[PDB]
Design a protein around this motif. Structure first.
Motif, PDB file in Angstrom:
ATOM      1  N   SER A  54     -24.645 -24.928 -46.199  1.00 12.14           N
ATOM      2  CA  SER A  54     -25.783 -24.960 -45.302  1.00 12.14           C
ATOM      3  C   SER A  54     -25.338 -24.560 -43.899  1.00 12.14           C
ATOM      4  CB  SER A  54     -26.432 -26.337 -45.291  1.00 12.14           C
ATOM      5  OG  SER A  54     -25.542 -27.291 -44.724  1.00 12.14           O
ATOM      6  N   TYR A  56     -25.919 -26.399 -41.391  1.00 12.58           N
ATOM      7  CA  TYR A  56     -25.389 -27.657 -40.884  1.00 12.58           C
ATOM      8  C   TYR A  56     -23.891 -27.711 -41.175  1.00 12.58           C
ATOM      9  CZ  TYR A  56     -24.126 -32.538 -40.269  1.00 12.58           C
ATOM     10  OH  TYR A  56     -23.499 -33.681 -39.840  1.00 12.58           O
ATOM     11  N   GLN A  57     -23.516 -27.417 -42.419  1.00 14.87           N
ATOM     12  CA  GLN A  57     -22.122 -27.462 -42.811  1.00 14.87           C
ATOM     13  C   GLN A  57     -21.297 -26.438 -42.030  1.00 14.87           C
ATOM     14  OE1 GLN A  57     -23.137 -27.128 -47.038  1.00 14.87           O
ATOM     15  NE2 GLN A  57     -21.980 -28.996 -47.447  1.00 14.87           N
ATOM     16  N   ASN A  59     -21.916 -25.233 -39.077  1.00 12.76           N
ATOM     17  CA  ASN A  59     -21.811 -25.694 -37.699  1.00 12.76           C
ATOM     18  C   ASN A  59     -20.706 -26.738 -37.581  1.00 12.76           C
ATOM     19  OD1 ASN A  59     -23.869 -23.977 -37.103  1.00 12.76           O
ATOM     20  ND2 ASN A  59     -25.431 -25.567 -36.874  1.00 12.76           N
ATOM     21  N   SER A  60     -20.648 -27.666 -38.545  1.00 11.30           N
ATOM     22  CA  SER A  60     -19.591 -28.666 -38.591  1.00 11.30           C
ATOM     23  C   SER A  60     -18.219 -28.002 -38.660  1.00 11.30           C
ATOM     24  CB  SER A  60     -19.781 -29.613 -39.741  1.00 11.30           C
ATOM     25  OG  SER A  60     -21.024 -30.292 -39.604  1.00 11.30           O
TER      26      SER A  60
END
Length: 94
Positions: A54, A56-57, A59-60
């Motif tokens: 994702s 999100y992943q 970005n992490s």
């Protein structure tokens, strides 16, 4: 071992079970640790071809300077008995 101080997030759901287990033992037997979760302590994330990440992943991963690699990073490092250049195994930057 060659994976000293490496913490691998394993996202390799679609690998055969025997290969998943071999990745784990290859990591453990050569100084590394592995998780199934992605967190700030991961140094690397191993991603088989059928898995995706994702935004999100991603970005992490960027935030925490995590290296994204395919399973060949593990296989070939073990084979060459030497930690290889993880930049040569990025499924997002071939």
């Amino acid at each position: 071992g060659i994976f000293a101080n490496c913490i691998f997030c394993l996202k390799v759901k679609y690998l055969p079970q025997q290969q998943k287990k071999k990745l784990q033992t290859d990591i453990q037997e050569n100084g590394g640790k592995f998780s199934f979760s992605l967190n700030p302590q991961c140094t690397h994330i191993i991603l088989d071809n059928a898995d995706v990440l994702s935004q999100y992943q991603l970005n992490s991963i960027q935030k925490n300077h995590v290296h994204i690699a395919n399973p060949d990073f593990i296989w070939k490092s073990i084979r060459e008995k030497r930690l290889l250049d993880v930049k040569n195994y990025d499924p997002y930057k071939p």
